[PDB]
Design a protein around this ligand. Structure first.
Ligand SMILES: C[S@](=N)(=O)CC[C@H](N)C(=O)O
Ligand SMILES: C[S@](=N)(=O)CC[C@H](N)C(=O)O
Lengths: 170, 170
């Protein structure tokens, strides 16, 4: 697969992947599916902030997965920190697309001069925790029963990657 | 001091405390002061969500401190979790107002049917972390350099309290 910036034509594929995660996994703690308009607004909001939306695609242009990041917490002081998301279409798992997407995202974040990338992962998702660990992320939090989905409590694991360790001051 | 729900007449007092924290402390990671309208909007927004705003007041009716809570993360799955804030006027420290406000806030949260209360504390605030530890809060996050203020990086500590540990499922 090849990694590139998402275009409007990729939204339908992104939408399908997102809604599949919503209905079948704990990767996203939302149970209500969204529509195209919702993802179009999201697409525009990201462009407005200069934040990237990447997609793993093939020669045909099918969306095999996507990744992006946005603000983490609503306070001026967290401006050097973003929370990202990586979604691989179910049938494309086990092919390293997650690694390709996250590596590309890390490079864009660093190029944008950001300082820290935060990952919010459901604690039982060993596959995701491992992917992040091998890309430099370190566990920074374990928060039990802070979430819920499918009628059960869920635990959240926080991980983070410092994009510029030598930058001792903002 | 007595603890009661805030009213519109308490906003100027709350505004002063908030803005003083903005300019002189690392309790809130914002460096821009707000105006009364901002607080009035916040006041009405909390009421709409059924979230309380409590004030510690004296015989003269002065706001010696205030506390409240709101959503922690923007996803449906976190609806059982709230993030709180507690501010004591700077001349009223050492008078147990923080404990008084937090204990009252905890009871309100439990009564509203919430599952977890989260505190977001600058890691160097030993006093605040100790106060929360004594109220049953446990450390669940330690994130280096995710914030900044006064031209330096700041570390964030997350602490949490399960309000109803016997509730097996949401
Ligand atoms: C919904 S969740 N388990 O907190 C994951 C959120 C995802 N990283 C996002 O930024 O949309
Ligand atoms: C700005 S901060 N250090 O993340 C504290 C935020 C505070 N708990 C609040 O809810 O507004």
């Amino acid at each position: 697969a090849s990694i590139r910036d998402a275009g409007v034509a990729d939204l339908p594929g992104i939408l399908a992947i997102y809604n599949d995660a919503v209905g079948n996994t704990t990767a996203i703690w939302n149970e209500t599916p969204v529509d195209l308009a919702n993802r179009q607004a999201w697409f525009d909001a990201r462009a407005r902030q200069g934040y990237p939306i990447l997609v793993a695609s093939d020669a045909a242009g099918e969306v095999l997965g996507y990744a992006s990041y946005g603000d983490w917490r609503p306070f001026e002081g967290f401006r050097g920190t973003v929370e990202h998301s990586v979604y691989v279409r179910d049938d494309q798992r086990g092919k390293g697309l997650g690694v390709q997407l996250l590596q590309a995202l890390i490079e864009r974040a660093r190029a944008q001069g950001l300082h820290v990338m935060v990952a919010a992962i459901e604690s039982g998702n060993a596959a995701s925790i491992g992917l992040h660990r091998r890309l430099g992320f370190e566990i920074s939090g374990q928060m039990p029963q802070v979430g819920q989905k499918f009628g059960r409590w869920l635990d959240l694991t926080f991980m983070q990657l410092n994009l510029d360790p030598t930058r001792s001051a903002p």
